[PDB]
Amino acid sequence: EVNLRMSWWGGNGRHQVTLKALEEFHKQHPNINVKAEYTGWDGHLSRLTTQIAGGTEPDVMQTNWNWLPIFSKDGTGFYNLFSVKEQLDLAQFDPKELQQTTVNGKLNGIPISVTARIFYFNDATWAKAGLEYPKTWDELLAAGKVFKEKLGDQYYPVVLEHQDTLALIRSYMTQKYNIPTIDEANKKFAYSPEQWVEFFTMYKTMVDNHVMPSTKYYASFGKSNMYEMKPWINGEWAGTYMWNSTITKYSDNLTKPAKLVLGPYPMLPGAKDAGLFFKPAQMLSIGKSTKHPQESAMLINFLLNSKEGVEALGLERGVPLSATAVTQLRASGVIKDEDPSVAGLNMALELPHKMTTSPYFDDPQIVSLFGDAIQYIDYGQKTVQETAEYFNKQGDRILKRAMR
Numbered sequence: 559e560v561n562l563r564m565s566w567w568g569g570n571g572r573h574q575v576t577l578k579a580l581e582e583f584h585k586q587h588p589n590i591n592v593k594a595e596y597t598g599w600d601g602h603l604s605r606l607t608t609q610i611a612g613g614t615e616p617d618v619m620q621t622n623w624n625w626l627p628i629f630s631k632d633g634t635g636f637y638n639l640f641s642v643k644e645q646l647d648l649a650q651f652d653p654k655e656l657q658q659t660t661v662n663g664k665l666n667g668i669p670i671s672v673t674a675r676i677f678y679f680n681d682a683t684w685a686k687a688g689l690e691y692p693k694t695w696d697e698l699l700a701a702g703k704v705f706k707e708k709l710g711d712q713y714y715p716v717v718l719e720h721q722d723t724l725a726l727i728r729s730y731m732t733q734k735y736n737i738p739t740i741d742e743a744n745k746k747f748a749y750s751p752e753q754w755v756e757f758f759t760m761y762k763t764m765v766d767n768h769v770m771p772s773t774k775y776y777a778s779f780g781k782s783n784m785y786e787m788k789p790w791i792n793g794e795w796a797g798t799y800m801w802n803s804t805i806t807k808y809s810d811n812l813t814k815p816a817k818l819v820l821g822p823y824p825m826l827p828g829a830k831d832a833g834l835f836f837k838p839a840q841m842l843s844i845g846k847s848t849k850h851p852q853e854s855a856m857l858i859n860f861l862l863n864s865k866e867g868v869e870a871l872g873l874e875r876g877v878p879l880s881a882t883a884v885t886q887l888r889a890s891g892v893i894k895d896e897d898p899s900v901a902g903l904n905m906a907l908e909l910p911h912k913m914t915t916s917p918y919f920d921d922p923q924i925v926s927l928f929g930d931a932i933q934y935i936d937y938g939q940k941t942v943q944e945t946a947e948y949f950n951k952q953g954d955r956i957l958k959r960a961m962r
């Protein structure tokens with residue numbers, strides 16, 4: 559009798575396939591029981607942080623790439639997956655993808671898929687507005703006015719949650735200035751005071767120009783998860799800047815015959831870098847002090863490499879990085895070139911994208927700092943310049959506490 563716990567986050571679609579997959583794993587292993595612990599994205603890091611701090615975390619965990627500096631600054635925060643290469647077939651995963659999940663020579667997670675945020679639009683609402691998807695940043699910004707005038711105050715080209723908006727304006731600044739957002743050497747942000755004014759100026763331009771809801775309007779709806787909101791479902795918020803690895807958590811909730819559809823990626827003329835946030839979409843990791851490292855490794859192998867786990871898990875986490883698994887899905891017809899999830903990624907890789915994102919750009923204190931920031935602008939409390947100075951200063955402080 560081996561009892562394991564496994565945690566993950568996701569939409570219900572992803573819960574349903576994972577639960578299906580675990581039922582098979584247990585069928586194939588009468589002696590290995592897994593308790594499942596699963597939520598949506600919200601509060602999930604927060605809960606696992608409490609567990610890790612009291613040493614009660616699961617044997618198997620779905621982890622995020624930006625959590626490596628949080629839990630595993632020295633690579634010892636999770637079990638070294640090189641120690642279970644007997645159970646877990648490592649050679650299926652690219653050596654260069656494995657390097658992103660390796661810290662101090664210790665393999666901390668198996669990246670499941672890679673992802674970048676890209677534009678996805680409600681094709682139904684865009685057809686009503688009689689617009690083509692923006693091919694440029696100017697078109698992005700000019701599209702809100704058309705939405706509001708052709709369809710009404712209630713229609714937006716996109717909805718952006720603050721984290722979405724952070725990634726977007728950084729993409730714009732990267733395209734423009736071709737520098738990293740974080741100076742990792744000096745433990746701080748790389749942008750000048752001016753560049754930060756320009757960053758929050760752009761937010762406010764987009765908000766003024768009716769591109770997406772302001773934070774104030776977004777909060778007149780209730781708290782709900784974005785994909786469960788009426789204006790998302792009703793097709794009133796007509797798009798998202800979103801990971802291809804979890805796009806169906808969004809599209810599953812549109813009203814037929816509306817589809818979320820790949821849009822073009824805006825690029826400034828002369829840009830030497832598309833400014834993607836491209837990374838492991840997520841990982842499977844083993845608890846540092848698991849009493850069952852081998853059975854855990856068997857479970858991770860099953861879900862990522864076995865015929866039956868691969869078939870069960872389908873594309874709820876994106877296009878598998880496992881050679882065997884992505885080949886299976888292609889052969890079964892599950893990966894198709896025209897799938898917006900698949901096409902999202904392919905279009906993205908062809909974008910020039912040499913700039914890597916620092917895991918610190920996605921520090922949860924920095925992300926919350928950013929939502930706070932644009933809330934001050936939207937609720938009249940801080941001007942654009944004050945907000946830019948406030949972000950620069952307080953975010954630098956977090957980066958020193960984060961980069962410790």
Ligand SMILES: O=C(O)C1=C[C@H](O)[C@@H](O)[C@@H](O[C@@H]2[C@H](O)[C@@H](O)[C@@H](O)O[C@@H]2C(=O)O)O1
Nearest residue numbers: 568599622673721801803804838839840875
């Ligand atoms: O596929 C996912 O569930 C996923 C891929 C991203 O790499 C992760 O950072 C994580 O993103 C979460 C959330 O699930 C997603 O809906 C979006 O809101 O952004 C979140 C984020 O932290 O970026 O999940």
